[PDB]
Amino acid sequence: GPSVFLFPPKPKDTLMISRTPEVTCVVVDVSHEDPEVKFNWYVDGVEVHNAKTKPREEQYNSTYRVVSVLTVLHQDWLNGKEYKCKVSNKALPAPIEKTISKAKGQPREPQVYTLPPSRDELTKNQVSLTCLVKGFYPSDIAVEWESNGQPENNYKTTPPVLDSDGSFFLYSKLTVDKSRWQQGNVFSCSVMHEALHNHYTQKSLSL
Amino acid sequence: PSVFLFPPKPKDTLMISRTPEVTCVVVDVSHEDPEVKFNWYVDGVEVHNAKTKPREEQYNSTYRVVSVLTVLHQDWLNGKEYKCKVSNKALPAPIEKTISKAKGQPREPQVYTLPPSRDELTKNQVSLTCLVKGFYPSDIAVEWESNGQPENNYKTTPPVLDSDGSFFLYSKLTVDKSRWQQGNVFSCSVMHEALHNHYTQKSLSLS
Numbered sequence A: 001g002p003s004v005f006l007f008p009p010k011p012k013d014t015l016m017i018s019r020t021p022e023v024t025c026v027v028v029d030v031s032h033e034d035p036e037v038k039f040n041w042y043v044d045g046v047e048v049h050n051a052k053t054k055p056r057e058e059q060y061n062s063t064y065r066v067v068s069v070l071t072v073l074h075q076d077w078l079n080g081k082e083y084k085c086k087v088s089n090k091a092l093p094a095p096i097e098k099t100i101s102k103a104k105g106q107p108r109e110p111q112v113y114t115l116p117p118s119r120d121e122l123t124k125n126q127v128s129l130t131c132l133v134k135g136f137y138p139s140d141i142a143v144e145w146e147s148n149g150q151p152e153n154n155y156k157t158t159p160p161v162l163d164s165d166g167s168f169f170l171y172s173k174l175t176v177d178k179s180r181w182q183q184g185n186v187f188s189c190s191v192m193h194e195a196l197h198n199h200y201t202q203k204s205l206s207l
Numbered sequence B: 001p002s003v004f005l006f007p008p009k010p011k012d013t014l015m016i017s018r019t020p021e022v023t024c025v026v027v028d029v030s031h032e033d034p035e036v037k038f039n040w041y042v043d044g045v046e047v048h049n050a051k052t053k054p055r056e057e058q059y060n061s062t063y064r065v066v067s068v069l070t071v072l073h074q075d076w077l078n079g080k081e082y083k084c085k086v087s088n089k090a091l092p093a094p095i096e097k098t099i100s101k102a103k104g105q106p107r108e109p110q111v112y113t114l115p116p117s118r119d120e121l122t123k124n125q126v127s128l129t130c131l132v133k134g135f136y137p138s139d140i141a142v143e144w145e146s147n148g149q150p151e152n153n154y155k156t157t158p159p160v161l162d163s164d165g166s167f168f169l170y171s172k173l174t175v176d177k178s179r180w181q182q183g184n185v186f187s188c189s190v191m192h193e194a195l196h197n198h199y200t201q202k203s204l205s206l207s
């Protein structure tokens, strides 16, 4: 009994035309008795025929895996067009269908706020710098840290929590050594979201 | 006939006035096959303190049976395991399931209260920030109180594994800009086993 899994493009892939958003349809538990699989793709009902399906790979449980990837348009995804993957197999009484698209709802511009560290944390070895992004819809977002054009990598981004007013919020905490923050250095919190102008914004944070 | 187990709520075990109540769930019950059985084993030894709630009726014609067992607070904190066993006339084997608290040395959380950014002053409301970090396990509970009464207009982020192996999160309490300008004091309460008396709190006020 095969099962089908569908995945959305990464949030950054759609916010800039420099990248290529894609939707991947994965089939697992492909029986050895009947390993033939056909992929039918549909976008808002009408069938599309520009899908690039890779040949099957046998897994270690003697079950094959077929993967079909369809490259989508940036504006089509941001306009909320449903993508449907149809998988047919001789071992399936009925074909399996999976649909995916952007979450419905009017886009909402996120608010970016940078918080200087608490006074209590000025005694410890390292100092936490926090960035608050709130009110953005949908949850597809990307937050990054850098200083003087150089990325910072000791940070963790929280999952988008559903706020009380139907919107989303999250926190991105950057961990830095004490000495760096004491020198009056400037750090920037970079946020990319579809409701922001040019799908990008940043705010500085210094002593 | 799927078996699912869930741990007690993190706040239940930290207060002796509550009940942990480990929950065992059996979904996709067989329509014609009745009498879902239940048995419990604690560290191997069988116990009989279960509360088998009467079943419900779901929309897809698959009812649910839940068995409830209350455990000792220290037993869960000491890491004792719990095993729920099920049987039926549609189940060939007695499918089991075991759950225990996360293994590892508990670490004391650090509580930091952060003020709203200067850019957020121009809005009708301001968002308070409480930073909890460096705690393990992820089982924790965060609340907000102001002048002896509970503020409930807040959302708490899920725990996130940090780079050192500890967890962290945030909680955002939203209050009207009028209240914050007066000088009202707001407290962030954190409950964890690694804290003395399983409780600590930090205040936050305009000054």
Ligand SMILES: *[C@@H]1O[C@H](CO[C@H]2O[C@@H](C)[C@@H](O)[C@@H](O)[C@@H]2O)[C@@H](O[C@@H]2O[C@H](CO)[C@@H](O[C@@H]3O[C@H](CO[C@H]4O[C@H](CO)[C@@H](O)[C@H](O)[C@@H]4O[C@@H]4O[C@H](CO)[C@@H](O[C@@H]5O[C@H](CO)[C@H](O)[C@H](O)[C@H]5O)[C@H](O)[C@H]4NC(C)=O)[C@@H](O)[C@H](O[C@H]4O[C@H](CO)[C@@H](O)[C@H](O[C@@H]5O[C@H](CO)[C@@H](O)[C@H](O)[C@H]5NC(C)=O)[C@@H]4O)[C@@H]3O)[C@H](O)[C@H]2NC(C)=O)[C@H](O)[C@H]1NC(C)=O
Pocket (backbone or CB within 6 Å): B002, B004, B006, B007, B008, B009, B020, B021, B022, B023, B025, B027, B028, B058, B060, B062, B064
């Ligand atoms: C017919 O209809 C059936 C019922 O209808 C329901 O269907 C639902 C989809 C939904 O629409 C409902 O509205 C509707 O009523 C339906 O039955 C489904 O079957 C599903 C089959 O997968 C099953 O889904 C699983 O759910 C669990 C967790 O479910 C809880 O949380 C989610 C949200 O996170 C909610 O669904 C819900 O809130 C569930 O309840 C939580 O648990 C308990 C409740 O008992 C609460 O805790 C207690 O609370 C009380 C409070 O009084 C006490 O305080 C007590 O002390 C507490 O303990 C808790 O608060 C509840 N809420 C929350 C938020 O937690 C998911 O985790 C499952 O995903 C996991 O499982 C798969 C398969 O095993 C794995 O891929 C993986 O599991 C684990 O993953 C780990 C990853 O790190 C890994 O390490 C582990 O090893 C791995 N596990 C194993 C064993 O290996 C996934 O992560 C899964 O989605 C539904 O729960 C069930 N319905 C109900 C009501 O239970 C039928 O499917 C449907 N169709 C048919 C054909 O019958």
Ligand SMILES: *[C@@H]1O[C@H](CO[C@@H]2O[C@@H](C)[C@@H](O)[C@@H](O)[C@@H]2O)[C@@H](O[C@@H]2O[C@H](CO)[C@@H](O[C@@H]3O[C@H](CO[C@H]4O[C@H](CO)[C@@H](O)[C@H](O)[C@@H]4O[C@@H]4O[C@H](CO)[C@@H](O)[C@H](O)[C@H]4NC(C)=O)[C@@H](O)[C@H](O[C@H]4O[C@H](CO)[C@@H](O)[C@H](O)[C@@H]4O)[C@@H]3O)[C@H](O)[C@H]2NC(C)=O)[C@H](O)[C@H]1NC(C)=O
Pocket (backbone or CB within 6 Å): A005, A007, A024, A026, A028, A029, A059, A060, A061, A063
């Ligand atoms: C036979 O073996 C198959 C292959 O498994 C491999 O081989 C075996 C021998 C072992 O070595 C495995 O470790 C190895 O992986 C099995 O296929 C697996 O089936 C299960 C279902 O039973 C699939 O689980 C599903 O996973 C979804 C997400 O999967 C992505 O993320 C995984 C990490 O979390 C990653 O490991 C996967 O490879 C996959 O990667 C994504 O790929 C896409 C495109 O390629 C990328 O765009 C993504 O970025 C990738 N992801 C990441 C994180 O980078 C889950 O979403 C899904 O859960 C959902 O559905 C369930 C209901 O089904 C809900 O309960 C749940 O809440 C959620 O909604 C599900 O867990 C697994 O992915 C399959 N493995 C692979 C590699 O695809 C067969 O199952 C096995 N059969 C038998 C009979 O033994």
